Design an enzyme around this catalytic site. Structure first.
Site, PDB file in Angstrom:
ATOM      1  N   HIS A 140       0.814  -1.213   0.000  1.00 31.74           N
ATOM      2  CA  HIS A 140       0.000   0.000   0.000  1.00 31.74           C
ATOM      3  C   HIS A 140       0.846   1.262   0.000  1.00 31.74           C
ATOM      4  CE1 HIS A 140      -3.059  -2.878   1.411  1.00 31.74           C
ATOM      5  NE2 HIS A 140      -3.919  -2.031   0.871  1.00 31.74           N
TER       6      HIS A 140
ATOM      7  N   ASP B 136      11.568  18.951   9.066  1.00 35.33           N
ATOM      8  CA  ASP B 136      10.571  19.135  10.116  1.00 35.33           C
ATOM      9  C   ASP B 136      11.292  19.725  11.326  1.00 35.33           C
ATOM     10  OD1 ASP B 136       8.736  18.958  12.218  1.00 35.33           O
ATOM     11  OD2 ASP B 136       8.193  16.880  11.812  1.00 35.33           O
TER      12      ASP B 136
ATOM     13  N   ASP C 240      14.897  14.543  10.166  1.00 32.32           N
ATOM     14  CA  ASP C 240      13.447  14.519  10.014  1.00 32.32           C
ATOM     15  C   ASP C 240      13.040  15.420   8.849  1.00 32.32           C
ATOM     16  OD1 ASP C 240      10.744  14.534  10.222  1.00 32.32           O
ATOM     17  OD2 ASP C 240      10.677  14.962  12.392  1.00 32.32           O
TER      18      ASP C 240
ATOM     19  N   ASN D 179     -23.707  -3.903   4.168  1.00 30.58           N
ATOM     20  CA  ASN D 179     -24.700  -4.974   4.168  1.00 30.58           C
ATOM     21  C   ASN D 179     -24.053  -6.262   3.663  1.00 30.58           C
ATOM     22  OD1 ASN D 179     -26.833  -6.683   3.919  1.00 30.58           O
ATOM     23  ND2 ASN D 179     -27.926  -5.465   2.368  1.00 30.58           N
TER      24      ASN D 179
ATOM     25  N   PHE E 105     -24.235  -9.204  -3.024  1.00 36.38           N
ATOM     26  CA  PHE E 105     -22.888  -8.770  -3.407  1.00 36.38           C
ATOM     27  C   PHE E 105     -21.894  -9.041  -2.279  1.00 36.38           C
ATOM     28  CE2 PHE E 105     -25.986  -6.073  -5.528  1.00 36.38           C
ATOM     29  CZ  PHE E 105     -25.665  -6.301  -6.863  1.00 36.38           C
TER      30      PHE E 105
HETATM   31  C1  LIG Z   1      -9.037  -1.618   5.194  1.00 34.33           C
HETATM   32  C2  LIG Z   1      -9.608  -2.096   6.504  1.00 34.33           C
HETATM   33  O1  LIG Z   1      -8.646  -1.768   7.462  1.00 34.33           O
HETATM   34  C3  LIG Z   1      -9.093  -1.843   8.778  1.00 34.33           C
HETATM   35  O2  LIG Z   1     -10.210  -1.014   8.898  1.00 34.33           O
HETATM   36  C4  LIG Z   1      -9.436  -3.250   9.098  1.00 34.33           C
HETATM   37  O3  LIG Z   1      -8.204  -3.848   9.290  1.00 34.33           O
HETATM   38  C5  LIG Z   1     -10.130  -3.961   7.971  1.00 34.33           C
HETATM   39  O4  LIG Z   1      -9.710  -5.280   8.066  1.00 34.33           O
HETATM   40  S1  LIG Z   1     -10.439  -6.350   8.834  1.00 34.33           S
HETATM   41  O5  LIG Z   1      -9.897  -6.284  10.173  1.00 34.33           O
HETATM   42  O6  LIG Z   1     -10.131  -7.642   8.231  1.00 34.33           O
HETATM   43  O7  LIG Z   1     -11.890  -6.143   8.848  1.00 34.33           O
HETATM   44  C6  LIG Z   1      -9.679  -3.575   6.584  1.00 34.33           C
HETATM   45  O8  LIG Z   1     -10.652  -4.013   5.620  1.00 34.33           O
HETATM   46  C7  LIG Z   1     -10.085  -4.509   4.428  1.00 34.33           C
HETATM   47  O9  LIG Z   1      -9.843  -3.511   3.454  1.00 34.33           O
HETATM   48  C8  LIG Z   1      -9.206  -3.955   2.284  1.00 34.33           C
HETATM   49  C9  LIG Z   1      -8.898  -2.801   1.419  1.00 34.33           C
HETATM   50  O10 LIG Z   1      -7.808  -2.727   0.851  1.00 34.33           O
HETATM   51  O11 LIG Z   1      -9.736  -1.928   1.312  1.00 34.33           O
HETATM   52  C10 LIG Z   1     -10.110  -4.927   1.577  1.00 34.33           C
HETATM   53  O12 LIG Z   1      -9.285  -5.669   0.708  1.00 34.33           O
HETATM   54  C11 LIG Z   1      -9.619  -5.510  -0.654  1.00 34.33           C
HETATM   55  O13 LIG Z   1     -10.626  -6.454  -1.026  1.00 34.33           O
HETATM   56  C12 LIG Z   1     -10.224  -7.786  -0.913  1.00 34.33           C
HETATM   57  C13 LIG Z   1     -11.375  -8.682  -1.188  1.00 34.33           C
HETATM   58  C14 LIG Z   1      -9.127  -8.033  -1.876  1.00 34.33           C
HETATM   59  O14 LIG Z   1      -8.756  -9.342  -1.546  1.00 34.33           O
HETATM   60  C15 LIG Z   1      -8.254 -10.055  -2.633  1.00 34.33           C
HETATM   61  O15 LIG Z   1      -9.244 -10.741  -3.355  1.00 34.33           O
HETATM   62  C16 LIG Z   1     -10.000 -11.779  -2.750  1.00 34.33           C
HETATM   63  C17 LIG Z   1     -11.360 -11.970  -3.156  1.00 34.33           C
HETATM   64  O16 LIG Z   1     -11.730 -11.338  -4.083  1.00 34.33           O
HETATM   65  O17 LIG Z   1     -12.116 -12.732  -2.604  1.00 34.33           O
HETATM   66  C18 LIG Z   1      -9.396 -12.541  -1.868  1.00 34.33           C
HETATM   67  C19 LIG Z   1      -7.943 -12.310  -1.542  1.00 34.33           C
HETATM   68  O18 LIG Z   1      -7.848 -12.223  -0.135  1.00 34.33           O
HETATM   69  C20 LIG Z   1      -7.307 -11.092  -2.180  1.00 34.33           C
HETATM   70  O19 LIG Z   1      -6.775 -11.472  -3.408  1.00 34.33           O
HETATM   71  C21 LIG Z   1      -7.987  -7.159  -1.430  1.00 34.33           C
HETATM   72  O20 LIG Z   1      -6.832  -7.424  -2.188  1.00 34.33           O
HETATM   73  S2  LIG Z   1      -5.484  -7.425  -1.537  1.00 34.33           S
HETATM   74  O21 LIG Z   1      -4.493  -7.726  -2.502  1.00 34.33           O
HETATM   75  O22 LIG Z   1      -5.478  -8.400  -0.514  1.00 34.33           O
HETATM   76  O23 LIG Z   1      -5.199  -6.182  -0.936  1.00 34.33           O
HETATM   77  C22 LIG Z   1      -8.366  -5.692  -1.484  1.00 34.33           C
HETATM   78  O24 LIG Z   1      -8.512  -5.158  -2.792  1.00 34.33           O
HETATM   79  C23 LIG Z   1     -10.506  -5.980   2.567  1.00 34.33           C
HETATM   80  O25 LIG Z   1     -11.408  -6.834   1.940  1.00 34.33           O
HETATM   81  C24 LIG Z   1     -11.091  -5.418   3.838  1.00 34.33           C
HETATM   82  O26 LIG Z   1     -11.319  -6.383   4.802  1.00 34.33           O
HETATM   83 CA   LIG Z   2     -22.858  -7.278   0.523  1.00 34.69          CA
HETATM   84 CA   LIG Z   3       8.400  14.567  11.386  1.00 31.72          CA
END
Ligand SMILES: C[C@@H]1O[C@@H](O)[C@H](O)[C@H](OS(=O)(=O)O)[C@H]1O[C@@H]1O[C@H](C(=O)O)[C@@H](O[C@@H]2O[C@@H](C)[C@H](O[C@@H]3OC(C(=O)O)=C[C@H](O)[C@H]3O)[C@@H](OS(=O)(=O)O)[C@H]2O)[C@H](O)[C@H]1O
Ligand SMILES: [Ca+2]
Ligand SMILES: [Ca+2]
Length: 481
Positions: free
Chosen positions: A107, A173, A183, A284, A289
């Site tokens: 990220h 900074d 920094d 939801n 979905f």
């Molecule tokens: C972003 C959120 O951060 C905190 O709030 C919290 O940790 C939360 O996590 S939780 O504790 O598990 O609830 C996080 O929620 C995740 O946010 C991710 C985001 O980047 O926004 C979401 O990941 C995206 O969606 C995933 C489905 C995707 O996963 C890929 O594809 C699939 C699938 O389609 O079924 C499964 C695989 O795991 C993976 O290939 C994510 O891809 S990634 O490469 O893993 O990053 C991503 O695009 C995530 O779903 C939220 O839970």
């Molecule tokens: Ca849903």
């Molecule tokens: Ca700083």
């Protein structure tokens, strides 16, 4: 047809890359201490994100020094006229997943912008929803006073002679929160620590330049099924940015919506307007979905995006937005036959663009959540509304892509095939794609990121290879427009 490679220029031999193994929630706490570089999400961190920008005859590129032991933030300026590549090494080093540098965190890109008004360089980097917290928090106090990481140069640094393109062009900074003489990371972009909460818990730096030379910037807050887009503007006169203002409210269910939702897409400045296009993730979990649904789009008639938002039909949009229904174009879910809860899977394959001629284009992709069912279904969708047309043309006669770009009278699909860049081209407002360019010799590439400008595609790429220190190249591709 017209598409040709103008230049390929090596930038470095050793940019950071995650060659280790794919950790997970159970194992992320036992990262390999050997030579290999384990990682939590993906392997890409260099030539990734908003990391390449052309400025006059220059091209600026951002990257992470290679070697799992190094990881320094880097900035290089390439003089396309002289061929020289000057690079500054910053002190900050990639801090990894939740602050542990042994776990690669894809990220945490290095966003980049150069002001055409005053030649200042701007970098926001190494961020994934970080906040102030303490040892019992998920970040174990590792981002206190350092949860938003901004570096930036004095005026005119962009055009400085090669010899003077050095770290000393950037501003330390020296606030009360400063962490020492090395920094270079500012906690806010306003230059007022009172705004720090306004810069908290943010991800994905992305820059645009307005038609009037004004820098715009937006980031994501939150994620999953509760997120928001925040954007601000560069005040060159005063050499500082405005505070972030939201496109949509977070916590929509508390702002009058039936549910929270996250956003999967982008804001883009196009045709002189800040715009957004995305698929939502409702909180939801009982509807059909599993993840995203819908395609949503809006634009702002306000130069800075502060209000006067409208949907594709020109209807006024509640701003900040609460209910995504106001700006819904169509439902990709309608193109697959399942209705049981969580049966419809929409994640990858979404992007959008608006041509200079005001053709509106969306691409997306829908499949069965359950990959094993006998009636498995999978489609790629292209929805586009020609300039003067009334309704969108929506077709599944389309192969799918991860991005769509535009320049002149055309839309493009650009990516890697067997390690080599290709370009597909179609007229704006059409579904008539054709491969018009395919590199076929030379070192192959693992991944890259693209920036469109000047009728050219700047393809900032990493070369294939072993290990965690790989070379980077810049290709300037003329698109023939
Ligand atoms: C972003 C959120 O951060 C905190 O709030 C919290 O940790 C939360 O996590 S939780 O504790 O598990 O609830 C996080 O929620 C995740 O946010 C991710 C985001 O980047 O926004 C979401 O990941 C995206 O969606 C995933 C489905 C995707 O996963 C890929 O594809 C699939 C699938 O389609 O079924 C499964 C695989 O795991 C993976 O290939 C994510 O891809 S990634 O490469 O893993 O990053 C991503 O695009 C995530 O779903 C939220 O839970
Ligand atoms: Ca849903
Ligand atoms: Ca700083």
């Amino acid at each position: 047809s017209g598409v040709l490679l103008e230049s390929q220029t090596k930038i470095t031999d050793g940019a950071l890359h995650f060659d280790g193994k794919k950790l997970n929630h159970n194992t992320f706490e036992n990262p390999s201490k050997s030579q290999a570089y384990d990682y939590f999400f993906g392997r890409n961190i260099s030539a990734h994100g908003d990391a390449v920008k052309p400025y006059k005859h220059f091209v600026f590129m951002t990257w992470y020094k290679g070697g799992k032991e190094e990881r320094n933030v880097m900035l290089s300026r390439f003089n396309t006229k002289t061929g020289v590549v000057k690079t500054i090494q910053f002190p900050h080093r990639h801090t990894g997943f939740r602050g542990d540098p042994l776990v690669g965190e894809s990220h945490n890109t290095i966003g980049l912008a150069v002001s055409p008004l005053n030649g200042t360089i701007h970098m926001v980097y190494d961020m994934h929803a970080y906040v102030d917290d303490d040892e019992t928090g998920r970040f174990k106090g590792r981002f206190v006073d350092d949860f938003f990481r901004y570096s930036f140069s004095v005026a005119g640094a962009a055009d400085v002679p090669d010899d003077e393109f050095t770290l000393e062009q950037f501003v330390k900074d020296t606030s009360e929160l400063s962490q020492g003489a090395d920094d270079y990371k500012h906690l806010t972009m306003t230059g007022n620590l009172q705004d720090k909460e306004n810069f908290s818990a943010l991800t994905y730096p992305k820059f645009y330049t307005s038609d009037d030379g004004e820098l715009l910037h937006y980031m994501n807050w939150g994620g999953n099924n509760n997120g928001a887009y925040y954007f601000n503007k560069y005040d060159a006169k005063n050499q500082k940015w405005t505070r972030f203002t939201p496109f949509n409210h977070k916590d929509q269910k508390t702002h009058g919506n039936a549910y929270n939702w996250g956003l999967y897409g982008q804001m883009k400045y196009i045709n002189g307007k800040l715009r957004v296009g995305f698929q939502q993730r409702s909180a939801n979990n009982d509807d059909r979905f599993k993840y995203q649904n819908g395609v949503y789009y809006a634009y702002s008639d306000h130069p800075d995006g502060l209000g006067n938002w409208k949907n594709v039909d020109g209807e006024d949009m509640t701003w900040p937005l609460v209910n995504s229904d106001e700006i819904k174009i169509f439902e990709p879910g309608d193109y697959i036959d399942h209705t049981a809860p969580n049966s419809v899977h929409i994640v990858t394959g979404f992007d959008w663009t608006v041509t200079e001629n005001d053709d509106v284009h969306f691409i997306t992709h829908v499949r069965s959540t359950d990959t094993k069912r006998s009636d498995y279904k999978e489609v790629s969708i292209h929805a586009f509304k020609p300039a003067n047309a009334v309704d969108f043309t929506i077709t599944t006669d389309f192969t799918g892509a991860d991005s769509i770009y535009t320049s002149g009278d055309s839309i493009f699909i650009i990516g890697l095939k067997n390690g080599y860049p290709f370009v597909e081209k179609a007229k704006g407002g059409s579904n008539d794609f054709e491969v018009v360019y395919q590199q076929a010799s030379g070192v192959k590439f693992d991944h890259g990121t693209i920036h469109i400008e000047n009728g050219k595609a700047y393809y900032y790429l990493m070369e294939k290879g072993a290990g965690n220190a790989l070379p980077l190249h810049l290709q300037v591709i003329d698109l023939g427009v």
